[PDB]
């Protein structure tokens, strides 16, 4: 909605003026945004993962997919095909509105916020931040709360470098201490 049209004017025009792009297709596009909740303590009871799924469904607009374990590990008492994590991959306009609520509303509420350090890019412009407790989104009632139950949001941009993706996310006024 808002951040899409603000992108389509200002971000493409500024990454045009300060990065040498003969074509507009070279400008990095934030493509998808996934919220992952690596619950993990549902080796004992899966009531907890069942609550965490509805917590993610309240945060985003999509019903989250439950992720079963890939290989069996006896270090953490997990079994093959045990549902141990939860995820949402949200792309398109719903991702744009989640990006609205993340920047304009959510990141002021991280409760002694000092600015997300920009060195969390992995090598090709994809960002990853970790939200430590779930109540930073105002969709949670906070009269109901049970556990802290954080998550991590990773943003996939089509940038190839860290500086191009950093300038892309900084063009949408990321905090960036």
């Amino acid at each position: 909605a808002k951040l899409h049209d603000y992108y389509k004017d200002e971000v493409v025009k500024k990454l045009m003026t300060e990065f040498n792009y003969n074509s507009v297709m070279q400008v990095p596009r934030v493509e998808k945004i996934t919220l992952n909740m690596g619950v993990g303590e549902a080796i004992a009871d899966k009531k907890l993962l069942d609550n965490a799924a509805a917590d993610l469904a309240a945060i985003s607009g999509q019903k989250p997919l439950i992720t079963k374990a890939r290989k069996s590990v006896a270090g953490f008492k997990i079994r093959q095909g045990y549902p141990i994590g939860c995820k949402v991959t949200l792309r398109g306009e719903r991702m744009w509105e989640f990006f609205e609520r993340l920047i304009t509303i959510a990141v002021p509420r991280i409760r002694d916020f000092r600015g997300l350090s920009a060195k969390s890019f992995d090598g090709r412009g994809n960002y990853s931040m970790g939200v430590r407790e779930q109540i930073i989104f105002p969709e949670i009632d906070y009269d109901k709360v049970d556990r802290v139950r954080g998550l991590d949001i990773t943003i996939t941009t089509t940038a190839k470098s860290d500086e191009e993706g950093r300038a892309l996310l900084a063009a949408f006024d990321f905090p960036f201490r």
Binding site: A57, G61, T104, I105, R109, G115, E139, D173
Partner: protein, 65 residues
């Protein structure tokens, strides 16, 4: 999207207590009244204010003449 399994996701009007109004498609079920905004936050404005980190010869002189 898969039709009925998703939660409702409606256009609401959030009421930013810094003075601002924002139409937002969300899930809260009412008109949410948030406290601080992306505007007028101390980190966003520049009022983060990390303290001096060493004012000992300042402190000695504001104590004693």
């Amino acid at each position: 999207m898969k039709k009925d399994i998703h939660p409702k996701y409606e256009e609401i009007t959030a009421s930013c207590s810094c003075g601002n109004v924002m139409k937002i498609r969300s899930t809260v079920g009412h008109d949410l009244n948030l406290d601080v905004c992306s505007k007028c936050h101390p980190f966003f404005t520049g009022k983060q204010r990390d303290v001096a980190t060493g004012g000992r010869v300042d402190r000695f002189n504001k104590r004693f003449n």
